[PDB]
Amino acid sequence: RALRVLVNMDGVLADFEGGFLRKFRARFPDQPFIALEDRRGFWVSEQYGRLRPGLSEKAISIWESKNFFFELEPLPGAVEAVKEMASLQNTDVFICTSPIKMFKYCPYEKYAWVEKYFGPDFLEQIVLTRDKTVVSADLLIDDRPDITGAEPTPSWEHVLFTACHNQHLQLQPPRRRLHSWADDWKAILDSKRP
Amino acid sequence: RALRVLVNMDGVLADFEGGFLRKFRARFPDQPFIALEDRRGFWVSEQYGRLRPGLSEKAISIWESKNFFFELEPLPGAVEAVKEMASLQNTDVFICTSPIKMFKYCPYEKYAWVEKYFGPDFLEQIVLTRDKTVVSADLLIDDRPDITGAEPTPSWEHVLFTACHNQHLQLQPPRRRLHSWADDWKAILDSKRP
Ligand SMILES: O=c1ccn([C@H]2C[C@H](O)[C@@H](COP(=O)(O)O)O2)c(=O)[nH]1
Numbered sequence: 001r002a003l004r005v006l007v008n009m010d011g012v013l014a015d016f017e018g019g020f021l022r023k024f025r026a027r028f029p030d031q032p033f034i035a036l037e038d039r040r041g042f043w044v045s046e047q048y049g050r051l052r053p054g055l056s057e058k059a060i061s062i063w064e065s066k067n068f069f070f071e072l073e074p075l076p077g078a079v080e081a082v083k084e085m086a087s088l089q090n091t092d093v094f095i096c097t098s099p100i101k102m103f104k105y106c107p108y109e110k111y112a113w114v115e116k117y118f119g120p121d122f123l124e125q126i127v128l129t130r131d132k133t134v135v136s137a138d139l140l141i142d143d144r145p146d147i148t149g150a151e152p153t154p155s156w157e158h159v160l161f162t163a164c165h166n167q168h169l170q171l172q173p174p175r176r177r178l179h180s181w182a183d184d185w186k187a188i189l190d191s192k193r194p
Numbered sequence: 195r196a197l198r199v200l201v202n203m204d205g206v207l208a209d210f211e212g213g214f215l216r217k218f219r220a221r222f223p224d225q226p227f228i229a230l231e232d233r234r235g236f237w238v239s240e241q242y243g244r245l246r247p248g249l250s251e252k253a254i255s256i257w258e259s260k261n262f263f264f265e266l267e268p269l270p271g272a273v274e275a276v277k278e279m280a281s282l283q284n285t286d287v288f289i290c291t292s293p294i295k296m297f298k299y300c301p302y303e304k305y306a307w308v309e310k311y312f313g314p315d316f317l318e319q320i321v322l323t324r325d326k327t328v329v330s331a332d333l334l335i336d337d338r339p340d341i342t343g344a345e346p347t348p349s350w351e352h353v354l355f356t357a358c359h360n361q362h363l364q365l366q367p368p369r370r371r372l373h374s375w376a377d378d379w380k381a382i383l384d385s386k387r388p
Pocket residue numbers: 008009010011042043044045046063096097098099100101
């Protein structure tokens with residue numbers, strides 16, 4: 001009866017792309033890089049890898065570093081929208097995020113980031129998982145085009161959140177986008193209510 | 195088509211009760227304590243609290259301390275059973291665990307513990323969430339009797355894993371127990387396959 005919405009973290013709430021590019025450039029000022037307008041495909045590391053050998057590993061070292069996740073800036077309108085969304089009647093919001101393989105900092109910083117922007121009480125709403133298909137909900141708002149895993153028939157509708165890496169992508173028709181948090185997320189939610 | 199089983203961590207894989215009692219006694223040798231045979235109810239902190247004021251907060255300080263989760267011993271047969279379970283055909287196993295409120299160490303140590311006992315490749319199978327009802331599966335093996343949250347009708351069958359705190363509990367009849375990892379967990383799984 002309550003509408004359940006999973007909101008992804010990196011690329012939706014937290015500006016992973018901008019934070020990564022900034023830190024990459026500062027740390028490796030003599031390497032080439034991918035401007036955000038030139039990003040294509042979810043996997044940053046694979047595009048940097050195709051650009052020049054050794055660059056996959058240098059890219060990875062940015063988000064494996066301490067404070068990378070913690071210091072990400074919120075995307076415009078994200079914190080305001082999620083706060084409003086969670087306060088709506090008959091609406092439960094979970095933040096659903098996949099940690100990286102190297103686990104020293106990332107889980108911790110993700111909890112700390114959520115505490116900073118949404119408050120201690122919002123920590124109960126965090127789901128950390130590498131497989132989103134085993135989390136049930138009516139909606140998943142996520143910038144990754146291909147969301148797969150152990151459940152072949154997820155209960156959520158995936159709404160693609162626009163990002164640099166996917167903005168050019170033609171989706172197969174039933175699939176739908178939320179173009180930014182300025183876009184009308186309330187209408188998308190309402191379309192799934194009885 | 196693949197059977198999906200969520201296996202809880204504390205009280206099922208990791209010996210939370212024994213580790214907590216040991217550390218509590220060493221740190222607070224002049225306080226009274228609850229012998230494992232005398233444990234009742236999921237909430238350790240509430241029983242210690244009823245035993246004498248200030249004791250809830252002393253209990254909590256044990257599992258909020260660094261290395262508490264990391265240094266938990268596996269329960270007998272747990273690692274062997276889960277490894278066998280995951281290797282079975284048409285069987286996907288996720289470890290589903292709820293972190294404490296204080297997030298400095300617990301998420302990290304839980305990943306580290308899983309790496310230590312199950313290997314790096316098993317990290318992909320971890321789901322950290324305070325709400326298990328929004329994780330979909332055929333089975334949830336968990337020592338907590340009352341598993342509630344945002345989804346009023348979870349897709350899993352909850353099988354109660356026996357622990358000191360619940361061993362005396364009469365369950366409402368349809369509900370079922372796995373008495374230890376020496377008990378016949380394969381028969382429980384098979385009962386849910388077509
Ligand atoms: O090339 C990449 C791009 C992203 N990520 C990771 C970083 C995050 O931990 C996760 C995405 O986080 P969420 O969008 O699920 O919050 O993917 C990688 O490992 N490699």
